[PDB]
Amino acid sequence: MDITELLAFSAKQGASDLHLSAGLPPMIRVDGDVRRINLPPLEHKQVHALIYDIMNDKQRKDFEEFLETDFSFEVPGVARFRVNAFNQNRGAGAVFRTIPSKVLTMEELGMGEVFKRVSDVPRGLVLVTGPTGSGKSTTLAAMLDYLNNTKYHHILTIEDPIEFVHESKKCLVNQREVHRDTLGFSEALRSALREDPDIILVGEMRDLETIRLALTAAETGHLVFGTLHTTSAAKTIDRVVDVFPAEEKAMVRSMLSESLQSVISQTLIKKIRVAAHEIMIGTPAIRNLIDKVAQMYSAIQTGGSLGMQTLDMCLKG
Amino acid sequence: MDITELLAFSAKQGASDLHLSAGLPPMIRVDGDVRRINLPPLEHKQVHALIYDIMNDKQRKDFEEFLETDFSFEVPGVARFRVNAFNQNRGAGAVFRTIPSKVLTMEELGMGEVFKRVSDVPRGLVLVTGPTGSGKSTTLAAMLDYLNNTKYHHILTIEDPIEFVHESKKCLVNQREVHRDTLGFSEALRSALREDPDIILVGEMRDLETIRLALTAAETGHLVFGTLHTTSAAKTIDRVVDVFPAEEKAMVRSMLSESLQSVISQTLIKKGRVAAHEIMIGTPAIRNLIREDKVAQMYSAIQTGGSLGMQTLDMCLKGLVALISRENAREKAKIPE
Amino acid sequence: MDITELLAFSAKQGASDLHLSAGLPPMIRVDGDVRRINLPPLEHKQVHALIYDIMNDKQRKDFEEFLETDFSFEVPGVARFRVNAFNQNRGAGAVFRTIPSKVLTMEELGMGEVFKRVSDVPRGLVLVTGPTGSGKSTTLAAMLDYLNNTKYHHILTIEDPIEFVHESKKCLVNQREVHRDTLGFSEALRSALREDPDIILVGEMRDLETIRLALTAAETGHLVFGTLHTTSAAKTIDRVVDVFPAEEKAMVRSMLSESLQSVISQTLIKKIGGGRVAAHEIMIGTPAIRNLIREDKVAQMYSAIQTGGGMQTLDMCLKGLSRENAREKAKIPE
Amino acid sequence: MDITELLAFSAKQGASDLHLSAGLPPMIRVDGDVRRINLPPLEHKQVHALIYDIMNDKQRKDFEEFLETDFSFEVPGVARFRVNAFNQNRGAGAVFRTIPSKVLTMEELGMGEVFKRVSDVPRGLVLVTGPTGSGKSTTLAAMLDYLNNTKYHHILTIEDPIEFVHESKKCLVNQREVHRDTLGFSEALRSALREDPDIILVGEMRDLETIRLALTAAETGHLVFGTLHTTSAAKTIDRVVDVFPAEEKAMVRSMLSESLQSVISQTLIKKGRVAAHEIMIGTPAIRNLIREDKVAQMYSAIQTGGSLGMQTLDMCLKGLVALISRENAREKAKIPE
Amino acid sequence: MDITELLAFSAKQGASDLHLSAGLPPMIRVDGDVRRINLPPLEHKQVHALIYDIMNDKQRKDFEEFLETDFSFEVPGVARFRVNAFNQNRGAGAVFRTIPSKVLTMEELGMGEVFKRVSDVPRGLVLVTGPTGSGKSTTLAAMLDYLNNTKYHHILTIEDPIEFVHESKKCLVNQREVHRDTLGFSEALRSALREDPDIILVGEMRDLETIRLALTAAETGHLVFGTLHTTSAAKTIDRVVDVFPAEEKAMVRSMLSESLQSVISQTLIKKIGGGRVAAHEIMIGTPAIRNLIREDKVAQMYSAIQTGGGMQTLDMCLKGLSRENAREKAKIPE
Amino acid sequence: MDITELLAFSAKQGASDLHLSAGLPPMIRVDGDVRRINLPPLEHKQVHALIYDIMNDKQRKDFEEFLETDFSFEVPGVARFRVNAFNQNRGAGAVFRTIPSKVLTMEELGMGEVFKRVSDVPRGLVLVTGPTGSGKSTTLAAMLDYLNNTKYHHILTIEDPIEFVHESKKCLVNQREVHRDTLGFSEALRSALREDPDIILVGEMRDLETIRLALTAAETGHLVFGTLHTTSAAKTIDRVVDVFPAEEKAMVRSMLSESLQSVISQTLIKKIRVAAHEIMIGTPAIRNLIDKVAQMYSAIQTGGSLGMQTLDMCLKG
Ligand SMILES: [Cl-]
Ligand SMILES: [Cl-]
Ligand SMILES: [Cl-]
Ligand SMILES: [Cl-]
């Protein structure tokens, strides 16, 4: 009995995660809960076996050198998994996070015109944020899909790794997977500025160079999508400007305030699982606001007739 | 004659610590006093022997590289210990702190709903602080236990070394011992952000980046547990923000003010003894107090926070009239009277 | 069937770009749209073959070492292309951007006296801005050409990389391509200050360095053209001053306010019945506006331009020109 | 046919510049126009030949390393030139700026006592500024000449490349050409501080450290000469202080305010043509103006500084009614009227 | 005649230092004065010989590589010396500082109950300060000894390098020498917080790090002694708080004001009729003074001490004791 | 005819500097003036010869590598010279600055009790500053001499290079010449803190480490002398604090304000050549002043009865 059977089983169960922990049977997180599969506990040896069985030298070298490591792993028919191996008090430990295979519709998600409208801006920056778990990628996928269905454009994405896979419809879609198709977000980004892209998607925004660059893309005339694990328009902004050395905030705050087209912060809630969105749209007033970002909320609250909304506001809905 | 026999003997003696020091016989601390066991003095060779005999490569490598190291060590039937080896003028030296094996639950510790409520927050930051001796951990352990008993979640802790060992009950509990299971708090923390944890216990605030990281964990949607040596909500906050370079306080003070779910500062008093807790709970008002710098006016905030179940330490103290006494109480009050 | 035939075909089609993407037939961007050529999809092997067939060792070495690379490639009778090879989920990928071959004229673009007048200022700063797409380079080129045809001066350009290539007519034209002819904008700029230039072209101006220097060039008595991607005189200004550390804005705002000769922001629009035509916002240096700059009251710039009538609001220009089509590019729709 | 014949021919033509550009025949700038000489176009090979033929290793090494380089070059009977080699789209490129061989003295330039007085200060900073074309150097040269004729001092200059060449008269004159005699302004400057110089001419303000250093030279007790492209005392100051990181302006503004002995901003006007000077002299009042940030109120300071011999540029302009004209004058006035 | 005979002779003379300097006879510092021994001058060769004769390869290798080096050296019956070899204009040079052999008592130093009382606080911070010369170490040692003789506790010391060596009496005494037993004050300090120490001795406290940590030790419930070179309670405080970045003083001033148990500044004076006696300024923790600290009103500290009478002003202490001799060490002469 | 004869001749002439410059006869600066010796001009070859003749490989290697170099050079009976070689438009160039051989008396210099008093402080910092040329070293030498004559102490000096040489009188005097006896000011300084020194002299204060260290010496209980090329007590202070990163001024300003015992700024004037001193003495008031250093002057002006004096004040004298 090997890790594929297990992984396969996770998927068939709708599991978002598979957890291996020396000393316990495999468990899966489903609808947020983490629960044992009806199988015998896995002793250290076993889990460690299971793990090594799907790593290569490098990975095996790290894991042993640094006691923990990350890599992705694919189950051909089933799905791809993000995989983190680590050691704990009882022995080996690995968690598998299943990656959304299918890129779902906008209607399928019940998203409205507001989204299209945002997706339609000719250029500038759009940030779709949300606590790691709120399915950012999907909203994104859907918005991307929407353009791929309506514009004869060139969507260039940079993912670490690639999440959904899109089919080139009206758009040339080129997805580059960090570490396989490209050396990193910054390298890839630079190239992008000369790959004739219309729309650029940047998965993770780990280092400043990625931000820095991403901004120049928005500034030089493209439409760019990136994501932060901020949970609020206001926080999102702060987050972006605040990670820069004092001596450089101005230039960033300035840039952003000019290219920021909209910010969407998302989050999942248990359905009588449905997504709540805070929506903030670019607006001459808000532009300015971008050091008085404090007075952003009430701005969004009165932004209704453009389609904006407080998260709480959305909630009550 | 090996270190187990010794360790076992400590326990049988109710020793809180066993001390090995090249040049002296083993000694144990009991009821606070440190006293030689009726054995011959241990020469350097011996203690260093005794020590390596229970270490592994890594540990041996550190000790050798950094002249000192920590790790935990278990005596199967007897108890677990917290082991620090170091060198001193006379030769090798090692101190063993026995780790509480048996867990007290909130019940066993007489902790009330307030605690559960706190433990129950979906995400954010919770700091359980207190001097050493104060018993912060037990409280912690009890809180963690409480969720492990009631939620199907994933508790991930990052201790140095591991405090109490938990049995996965309703929770997947993964405890990682720094230096053995992981290279350090920061490395471990990062991984955590992608190990699908619900609750993260950060052992100590090993350094700025540990804080930095710990905060982003609270921010991105995990309940995070951490601890300080601060003895007051107010001080605890200050302590957190103040250890950052001026150029960066804002972003920290801002963060904290958003993710701080509650602060509990504890301390032991001679009953046995019994724990006094200052309890401060997250609250739109207090939030500001933090965001803004007006942390000064926090105290009266807590004093009127009664109905969320908050409490001044002193406030708590007076209660303990009901075990405790005044004499001592005065000795720990913030404002004796 | 090889990449030349394709490239050739792009040009014949007026394509601005040729795109190769393993898994899809070749596509070209024309009038801003990207569309498949009526050819069979190119499998990984093929595109990768096509690519390598035109690269040399170095290029092939990089591409393989760094998974992506750039280089230029020429089709003798047809045109030169700036070529980026990269890898994507489906296999190889390469995009060919055709480079303007002809250094093309001011009449041909229907630009008026206003432009000449601007081009004619003896010294100072001229910024031609606009975001990728609006081919200002084209207008710039035309303006430069204009002088190259009328003044016995020395035009010295610093481009990364050289866009249009000019032939020395009445002017000595020296174009330096960053990274080939020079180490960088700043290095090049300094030299320029002692290369006896009349007119200096600074390709892009995205950096404190380049800006700083560009300004001193304008200040020491030269005519300097620079460019941006801002879409508005007002924004352009803000953009320049705002990218400097607080402690230094004054000196920049001050400088600019003295050397700024004119700002032109451009943009392309779908010509009613095929094609596309450029709309220009034009703002000219003027004692009043100078202040507006030196002081911080750039806000009240708009109305200044509106009463500056050869100046013009972009919207103003628009109306001049498919209705809803444009009102779609207004700063105030209607 | 070699570069000398050409250079010689330039001079005979009154050319201010000779231009070599791979792909075109040699051209010269005369009366501001640039025009081809009646010779066949020069292919890359040729111009690159011509060039190396007059460079030495170092120069050749730079050109090769940094794709461009500067140096001076002399035609014995004819004149000295300022040589920059660079590459352009068509191939090699080089521009020769002829250096004024003959010196005009204050007399020949009609400069008055004000200048001598300034040149005579025992130590401190003197900035002679002006756009290119303005003739700042000549003035400079003349000032330097003046002391070289009257003091038994040691003038040390650090040009890139060397402007005018001086003959040691009453002064030991040591001119160091950056890239040939010295690695750079900063390296050279440091040495200067221990070469027993009285007067130091710094060519250009190559960079922050050049400024930094130049200032300490003024501060430690040397007369220092420097130049900017600024066209006004007020701007000159701003320019100096403003190019420093915020965190450091104070120390610069402070320094300057103490060592600034005088600022002269110059400019040429169509007579021939004739030079207009704005003159600003060090003065306890103005000092403050600098130390404090109130440089704004400098202008009126100069306007009442008449008796030390200070003068607004405009002020100076109107004088030139006596050659010059209004039409033009308006064109350079700070406030046309 | 070798360096042992000399060293031995120093000790017999009560010398604190032996100095070798090529070109001069050996000299010793006694009672603060440095004076030649009645011996012939030592030529370069000699001192250099004398030196090398007691060094080993490593030491000889450094000395030659880095022109100077340190190491310790012991005279079996007599004492250990901390030894620095260096080169000077005349040739070799070496200075021998004798290290206190005996961990010497509180009576022997005529220190009173005040000291015991201080030493007896269960936890908090105690600072014994004074500049090089005033051998506080001595008082410190005596205080530590006092507890080592009366409490069954664990004294853990962190010294660079270990000064007096204590024998474990009622206390477990662990002394760690920075650079030999530990990598640094901070590393060592951290470990300490989990070595079950009762009393912690931090040799010197000259660094944000060491201070920071030292404080947390006092804060988490320990008794920590640290030292300085300040010569006054008031100055001592200032000195601690003032070496921190503005943005962090509060937290430090706050901490200190809570853990500061007492400050002792010391100094030596020439005992009327030979020798020397120590004068101590004594300042004790006190609710009032606490505030004075937490608040910034440290100024009004003096009068606080003056009315704190076991506390004492230094001057106050002085009068207690050759007249003009002292009035020479007053904060207010007379 | 070689460079020794010349150098010798300089000394016999009271020259402060000998200048060699390809294209001109040798010249010497005397009483501030620089004048040709009655000798034929030195062609490039010659001066370059003369120079190489007294350099060694290293020096010759630098000079050629870096087009300029420094080193010292001694004329056995005569004096030691600081020597800077450089290249100029005409060829080689070298300047020789003669170093004060003799360390002169305090009386010989007509310096008063103020100086003794300063020299007598048991510890702390004393800065003798003055434009490179004002003979700082001498005032210093004299003060040092004064203690060497009156205290049984250990004077340790660190010079680059050694200027005057002192004879151990009542003091153990140990002079260490940077680059010969020690690797640098910082290395040497550190050692000093454990060489049982009473008084420490630090010639140059090039880098912060030297300052930093020098201060800790003053702070830990020694008397330290150092020099800056500042010309004023007020400037001197500023100079010291201002060269430190913002994040560290406090600690420096704080330290200094506690250890600063006195500042003396000097300068030479043409005698009907006599030294003018500005004298500033440590003082509870001034201590505080050390950010209000601005209000320092008037403090010194009223400091008379302690012995302080404005430079100008001194001048009129
Ligand atoms: Cl505890
Ligand atoms: Cl374009
Ligand atoms: Cl000029
Ligand atoms: Cl001592």
Write the DSSP symbol of residue A160: S
Instruction: Tell me: cis bond preceding C161? Omega within 30 of 0 counts.
Output: yes
How far the first Cα of chain F sits from its last, in Å, is 47
**B24 contact E CB<8A:** yes
Using an 8 Å Cβ cutoff, are A222 and C132 in contact? yes
Q: How would you write C133-159 as a 3-class SS string?
A: CCCHHHHHHHHHHHHHCCCCCEEEEEE
Number of Cβ atoms within 10 Å of the Cβ of F247: 14
Residue A243, both tokens = 């990670």
Q: How many CB atoms lie under 10 A from the CB of residue A273?
A: 9
**H-run or E-run covering D84:** strand D79-88
Contacts of C17 in chain A (CB under 8 A): 196
CA of C138 to the centre of ligand 2 (A): 7
Contacts of residue E307, defined as CB under 8 A and 6 or more positions apart, other chains included, come to none
Please report, as a single letter, which amino acid is at residue D64.
E
Alpha-helix runs per DSSP H in chain F: 3-12, 44-52, 57-66, 113-120, 136-148, 185-192, 208-220, 233-242, 249-259, 284-289, 297-301, 311-316
Alpha helices in chain E (DSSP H): 3-12, 44-52, 57-66, 113-120, 136-148, 185-192, 208-219, 233-242, 246-259, 287-294, 302-306, 314-320, 323-327
Find chain B residues with C-beta within 8 A of A97's C-beta: 194, 196
How far does residue D133's CA lie from ligand 3's centre (Å)?
Answer: 4
D209, containing H or E segment: helix D208-219
DSSP annotation string for E204-258: ---SHHHHHHHHHHHHTT-EEEEE---SSHHHHHHHHHHTS-HHHHHHHHHHHHH
Whether residue B76 sits in one domain with residue B15: yes
- Give Cβ neighbours of residue F247 (< 8 Å, ≥ 6 apart): B245, B246, E245
CA–CA–CA angle F59, F64, F66 (5° rounding): 90
Half-sphere exposure of B177 (CA within 13 A, CB side): 19
| Cβ within 8 Å, pair E17-F123 | no
Structural domain harbouring B8: 1-100
DSSP string, A214-251: HHHHHHHT-EEEE--S-SSHHHHHHHHHHTS-GGGHHH
Q: Tally the residues of chain E.
A: 334
- Positive/negative CA dihedral, D225, D226, D231, D237: negative
**What are the beta bridge partners of residue E124?**
E223
How many whole angstroms separate alpha carbon D106 and alpha carbon C326? 65
The CA-based diameter of chain A, rounded to the nearest angstrom, is 61
CB-based contacts of C171, cutoff 8 Å, min separation 6: C147, C148, C151, C152, C153, C154, C155, C198, C199, D34
What kind and span of H or E run contains F126?
Answer: strand F124-129
Report the length, in residues, of chain F.
Answer: 317
Residue type, D270: K
In angstroms, the CA E224 to CA E226 distance is 6
d(CA D309, CA B240): 62
| Of residues C23, C88, C97, nearest to A176 (C-beta) | C88
Same domain assignment for residues B132 and B159: yes
Domain identity same for A114 and A162: yes
- Candidates F51, F52, F56, F25; CA nearest to F40 is F25
Contacts of F166 (CB under 8 A, 6+ apart): F103, F141, F144, F145, F148, F155, F173, F175
CA of E132 to the centre of ligand 4 (A): 5
Q: Are residues B69 and B114 in the same domain?
A: no
* Domain count of the fold of chain D: 2
- Residues C142, C191 within the same domain: yes
Asked whether residue F114 falls in the same domain as residue F200, the answer is yes
Q: Nearest ligand to the C-alpha of residue E268?
A: 4
> B232 C-alpha to center of ligand 1: Å?
15
Give CA–CA dist C100/C137, Å, rounded. Answer: 10
- What the block records as the tokens of C312 is 């013009």
- CA distance linking residue D286 with residue D280, whole number of Å: 9
CA angle, corner C208, sides to C207 and C212, nearest 5?
A: 120
Q: Is the dihedral of CA E21, E24, E30, E32 positive or negative?
A: negative
Chains F and E touch (3+ CB pairs under 8 A): yes
Joined tokens for residue F57: 């490989």
Same domain, A70 and A121: no
Residue B271, helix vs strand vs coil: coil
CA distances from D23 to D38, D39, D69 (A): 14, 12, 20
Question: What interhelical angle do F136-148 and F113-120 show, nearest 10?
Answer: 70
Longest dimension (CA), chain D: 63
Q: Which of A52, A54, A225 is nearest to A136 (CA)?
A: A225
**Cis ω before E161 (30° cut-off from 0):** yes
Peptide bond between residue D161 and the one before it cis (omega within 30 degrees of 0): yes
CB F130 within 8 A of CB F229: yes
E131 interface with F at CB cutoff 8 Å: yes
Separation CA E95–CA E74 (nearest Å): 14
Test mutation, E191, E223, E251, chain B, max B CBs within 10 A: E191
Tokens of D332: 């350079």
Cα–Cα distances in Å, from E212 out to E123, E216, E219, E254, E256? 17, 7, 11, 12, 10
Tokens of D160: 């890139």
CATH number at residue D3: 3.30.450.90
Residues of C in contact with D245 (CB under 8 A): 245, 247
Burial C53-63 (b: 16+ CB within 10 A, else e): ebbeeebeebb
Produce one character per residue of F24-63: b if its CB has 16 or more CB atoms within 10 Å, e if not: bebbbbeeeebbebeeeebeeebbbebbeebbeeebeebb
Check whether the bond before F161 is cis (ω within 30° of 0): yes
Reported resolution, Å: 3.1
Cross-strand partners of F264 = F128, F279
F136 and F240 fall within a common domain: yes
CA A276 to chain centre: 16
The answer to whether D and F touch (≥3 CB pairs < 8 Å) is yes
**Amino acid letter, residue D141:** A
In 10 A of CB E274, how many CB atoms? 7
Domain end position, chosen among B100, B117, B133? B100
DSSP assignment letter at B296 = G
For the four alpha carbons of F177, F180, F186 and F191, in that order, the dihedral sign comes to negative
Distance CA B80, CA B96 (A): 9
Tell me which of E100, E123, E142 is where a domain ends: E100
Q: From residue A151, how far is each of A144, A170, C30, C34, D270 by CA, in Å?
A: 10, 6, 13, 9, 61
Q: CB neighbours of F271 closer than 8 A, spacing ≥ 6?
A: none
Q: Are residues C93 and C106 in the same domain?
A: no
Determine whether the interchain pair A97/B196 forms a contact, defined as Cβ–Cβ distance below 8 Å.
yes
Q: Across E76-170, where does the E strand assignment appear?
A: 79-88, 91-98, 124-129, 154-159
Which two tokens mark A232?
């609020």
Residues 6 or more apart in contact with residue A145 via CB below 8 angstroms: A103, A105, A106, A166
Q: Quick one: which of F272, F155, E178 has its CA closest to B68?
A: E178
The whole-angstrom separation of Cα E184 and Cα E161 is: 11
Distance (Å, whole) CA F202 – CA F186: 10
Q: How far is CA C155 from CA C169, D230, E241, in A?
A: 11, 24, 62
Q: What is the CATH number of the domain that holds C200?
A: 3.40.50.300
For residue F206 the two structure tokens come to 């090039």
State residue D29 phi and psi, 5-degree precision.
-95, 125
Q: Which of C23, C95, C131 lies closest to A123 in CB terms?
A: C131
Distance E129 CA to ligand 4 centre (A): 10
C-alpha to C-alpha distance for F142 and F139, rounded to whole angstroms: 5
Place of tokens 């030999």: E180
Task: Indicate whether F36 and F6 sit together in one domain.
Answer: yes
F188 touches chain E (CB under 8 A): yes
Own/partner long-range contacts of E29-38 (Cβ < 8 Å, ≥24 apart): E29/F154, E29/F196, E31/E270, E31/E275, E31/E276, E32/E133, E32/E268, E32/E276, E33/F152, E33/F153, E34/F152, E34/F153, E34/F154, E34/F171, E34/F172, E34/F198, E35/F152, E37/E6, E37/E9
Q: Do E154 and B229 touch (CB under 8 A)?
A: no
Pair F256, F135 in one domain: yes
H or E segment to which residue A68 belongs = strand A68-75
Q: How far apart are CA C252 and CA D37, in angstroms?
A: 41
Q: For residues D310 and D280, what is the distance between their CA atoms, to the nearest angstrom?
A: 5
State how far Cα F239 lies from the chain centre.
Answer: 16
Q: Judge if C44 and C112 occupy the same domain.
A: no
F97 strand-pairing partners = F17, F82
Strands, DSSP E only, in chain B? Answer: 17-21, 24-30, 33-36, 68-75, 79-88, 91-99, 124-129, 154-159, 172-177, 199-202, 223-226, 260-270, 273-281
